[PDB]
C-alpha cells in the first residue's frame, strides 16, 4: 500500500465551490516528495474568476500524502492506498466566515486524484475575504487523534492582513480511510508543522502557486506519567 507512494508523486486536483453566491471551478497540476513533505501545486479558476474573494480562503483545499514522519509515527495516509482516502473540514473564522469541505484522494495510473467540493459561507461584505485584505498564511501546527477508524484533526490558523495583524480560523476535519482497518496500523496522537506559501500568482489570482512543506512529530517533551 505504502510501496504505491513514490519519492516523487504527481497530482491533479479538481475544485468545485460556492462562497457567497458566487460559483466557481478550479484545476490543479502539482508534484512533490510524499517522504520529505515538500510539494507545489499550480492552481488555474476555470471558471468564475476572478474571484470576489480572498483567494488564501482556499489555501487549505488545495494534501495530506506529502507529509514527513519521524519518530516511527505511523503514515494514516500513505497506507491507506490504493484505495486511497476521504476528509471533511469545517472551517469557522472569527468574523463568522464558514467554509465546508469534503474531499476525495484517489491513486489512477500512479497519479493521486483530489476531488473537492466546497460551500464557504456567512463571510461579511466588509471583511478582508470579500475586500481582498489578506496577506497569506502563517506556519501552523494541527493536533490529530485516534477516532474510530479514521483521524480527527484541529488547527487554530491566523490570517495575516493587510495593514497589519490576523484574522483568526480554527479548522475541524475528519479523515477516512477507505482501506479495512484490519490493514492499518493506527497512530496514536501526534502533531504536524506546517508552512503553506503563495510562491506565484497571476491574472487577478486566477492562477496561483503554492507551496507546502510538513513534518510530523510528538511533543518531544520529558513526561512524568
Not at 74 to 98: A, L
Not at 107 to 128: E, W
Not at 165 to 182: M, Q, V
Amino acid at each position: 500500500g505504502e510501496e504505491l507512494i513514490k519519492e516523487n508523486m504527481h497530482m491533479k486536483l479538481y475544485m468545485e465551490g460556492t462562497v457567497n453566491n458566487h460559483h466557481f471551478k478550479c484545476t490543479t497540476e502539482g508534484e512533490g516528495k510524499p517522504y520529505e513533505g515538500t510539494q507545489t501545486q499550480r492552481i488555474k479558476v476555470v471558471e468564475g474568476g476572478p474571484l470576489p474573494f480572498a483567494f488564501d480562503i482556499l489555501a487549505t483545499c488545495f494534501s495530506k500524502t506529502f507529509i514527513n514522519h519521524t519518530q516511527g509515527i505511523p503514515d494514516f495516509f500513505k497506507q491507506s492506498f490504493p484505495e486511497g482516502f476521504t476528509w471533511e473540514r469545517v472551517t469557522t473564522y472569527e468574523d463568522g466566515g464558514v467554509l465546508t469541505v469534503t474531499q476525495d484522494t484517489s491513486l489512477q495510473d500512479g497519479c493521486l486524484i483530489y476531488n473537492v467540493k466546497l460551500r464557504g459561507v456567512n463571510f461579511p461584505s466588509n471583511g478582508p475575504v470579500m475586500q481582498k485584505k489578506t496577506l497569506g498564511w502563517e506556519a501552523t501546527t494541527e493536533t490529530l487523534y485516534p477516532a474510530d477508524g479514521g483521524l480527527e484533526g484541529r488547527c487554530d490558523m491566523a490570517l495575516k492582513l493587510v495593514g497589519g495583524g490576523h484574522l483568526h480560523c480554527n479548522l475541524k476535519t475528519t479523515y477516512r480511510s477507505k482501506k479495512p482497518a484490519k490493514n492499518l496500523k493506527m497512530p496514536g496522537v501526534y502533531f504536524v508543522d506546517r508552512r503553506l506559501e503563495r510562491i506565484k500568482e497571476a491574472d487577478n489570482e486566477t492562477y496561483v502557486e503554492q507551496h507546502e512543506v510538513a513534518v510530523a512529530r510528538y511533543c518531544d517533551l520529558p513526561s512524568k506519567l
